[PDB]
Amino acid sequence: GSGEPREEAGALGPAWDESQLRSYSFPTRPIPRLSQSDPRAEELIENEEPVVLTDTNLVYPALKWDLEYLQENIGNGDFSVYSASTHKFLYYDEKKMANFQNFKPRSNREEMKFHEFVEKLQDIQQRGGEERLYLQQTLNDTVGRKIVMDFLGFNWNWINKQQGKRGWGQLTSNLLLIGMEGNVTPAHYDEQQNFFAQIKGYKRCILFPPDQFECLYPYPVHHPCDRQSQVDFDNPDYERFPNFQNVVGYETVVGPGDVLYIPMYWWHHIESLLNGGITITVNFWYKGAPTPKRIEYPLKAHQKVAIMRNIEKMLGEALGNPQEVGPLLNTMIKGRYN
């Protein structure tokens, strides 16, 4: 798993204990925790494998952040706040909701000012209700001057060197994440390189390499939950998803000051620790390096995932209806390739 819980400086006790981790059916092994000066960390990022960097100082000015400080300085912009009846915040593409009419969302999005989100959070704690909120908002110009000064204080020297040494594309987005304890972002994979900068609280990160595509059963590309696993990690249906019994993850717990490299196309299941308070995270997303001119074989697992995605996209446009993608694929292989 995450190994033994780390001891905090000043003898302040264990940062967490195992009772704050949710229980699942699959084994894991630890993601390495290394210094940014460690060459092994450099070779992991280069080979697109996850690593937790403990001393980047990437978001050092943001480590003082909390709700009180942010509400006063984050400005009067709008923030996307997702609500959920349960602890699972399954994301859904609103653009693709037209393809699947028999899909009703379980986590409705709502725009609100930051002071409204802080107010709405404190009502749930007062009322003792079980409703959960998760702020997920991209940062921009509307933020106040002090947040701008903190942002400029980020270790741009280090992360821009990482961008150059890997040949990545440009920085596409900065996502601010503020979640309640026990909030779970279920397993999914992204298409860009991610630097996961933990700020407040602790998050358990369970990653799965791209070659376990067969064990995680993502939704159809045209489904609103595209790129997310169909498997309910809390109650896996081994009849529908038999190879989930073969899944093995990479696990770590990140805390304030840690940066987790989530490589492009790697599955990740992220949860804020139980009874751990609020969590704050800022992501750095970079387009991957361009596909090289001389195609080398055998193909990497994420390249085959890209191929499978393009086949499904091409079929949807070719047939004139994404719902015919399924039956044509079955017609193509039944009694011919299985």
Residues in contact with its own copies by CB under 8 A are 213-214, 217-220, 230, 240-243, 297-299, 304, 307-308, 311-312, 314-315, 318-320, 325-326, 328-338
Strands 51-53 and 33-34: parallel
| Helix 39-46 / helix 156-165 crossing angle, nearest 10 deg | 50
DSSP element (H, E) containing 123: helix 114-127
Nearer to ligand VIZ, 247 or 270 (CB): 270
Per CB under 6 A, contacts with ligand VIZ among 163-192 are: 172-173, 175, 177, 179, 185, 188, 190-192
Question: Do 31 and 285 form a contact (C-beta atoms < 8 A)?
Answer: no
Give the nearest distance from C-beta 225 to its own copies in angstroms.
12
Is position 141 annotated in a ligand binding site?
yes
Nearer to ligand VIZ, 38 or 83 (CB): 83
275 binds ligand VIZ (CB under 6 A): no
Give the nearest distance from C-beta 179 to its own copies in angstroms.
29
User: CA-CA distance, 275 to 20, in Å (whole number)?
Assistant: 7
User: CA-CA distance, 266 to 196, in Å (whole number)?
Assistant: 13
Per CB under 6 A, contacts with ligand VIZ among 12-71 are: none
DSSP for 204-245?
A: EEEEE-GGGHHHH-BPPTTSTTTTBB-S-TTS--TTT-GGGG
By a kind-dependent CB cut-off of 5 to 8 A, residue 136 interacts, out of ligand VIZ, Zn ion, its own copies, none, with: ligand VIZ
User: CA-CA distance, 89 to 263, in Å (whole number)?
Assistant: 22
Nearest to residue 211, comparing CAs of 252, 163, 250?
250
User: CA-CA distance, 321 to 99, in Å (whole number)?
Assistant: 8
Is position 203 annotated in a ligand binding site?
yes
Is position 188 annotated in a ligand binding site?
yes
Is position 310 annotated in a ligand binding site?
yes
Which whole-number Å values give the CA distances from 288 to 12, 193, 270, 297, 300, in the listed order?
A: 40, 6, 22, 19, 14
Is position 289 annotated in a ligand binding site?
yes
Residues across the chain: 338
DSSP for 251-276?
A: EEEE-TT-EEEE-TT-EEEEEEPTT-
Neighbouring residues of 69: CB distance < 8 A, sequence distance ≥ 6 = none
Nearer to ligand VIZ, 191 or 234 (CB): 191
Give the nearest distance from C-beta 242 to its own copies in angstroms.
8
Is position 171 annotated in a ligand binding site?
yes
3-state SS, residue 193:
strand
Q: Which stretch binds Zn ion (CB under 5 A): 132-140, 190-198, 207-215, 329-337?
A: 190-198
312 binds Zn ion (CB under 5 A): no
Question: Which of 38, 93, 190, 232 is in the footprint of Zn ion by CB under 5 A?
Answer: 190
Per CB under 6 A, contacts with ligand VIZ among 110-149 are: 136
Is position 190 annotated in a ligand binding site?
yes
By a kind-dependent CB cut-off of 5 to 8 A, residue 337 interacts, out of Zn ion, ligand VIZ, its own copies, none, with: its own copies
Is position 47 annotated in a ligand binding site?
no
Is position 212 annotated in a ligand binding site?
no
Question: Do 83 and 108 form a contact (C-beta atoms < 8 A)?
Answer: yes
Is position 315 annotated in a ligand binding site?
no
| Helix 325-333 / helix 301-319 crossing angle, nearest 10 deg | 120
Nearer to ligand VIZ, 131 or 191 (CB): 191
Binding-site positions for 2-oxoglutarate: 134, 185, 194, 203, 283
> Which residues of the chain form contacts with ligand VIZ (CB under 6 A)?
91, 136, 172-173, 175, 177, 179, 185, 188, 190-192, 203, 268, 270, 281, 285
Please report, in range form, the residues annotated as the binding site.
Answer: 134, 141, 170-172, 185, 188, 190-192, 194, 203, 227-228, 268, 283, 289, 310
**Known binding positions for substrate:** 141, 170-172, 190-192, 227-228, 289, 310
Binding site for Zn ion (CB under 5 A): 190
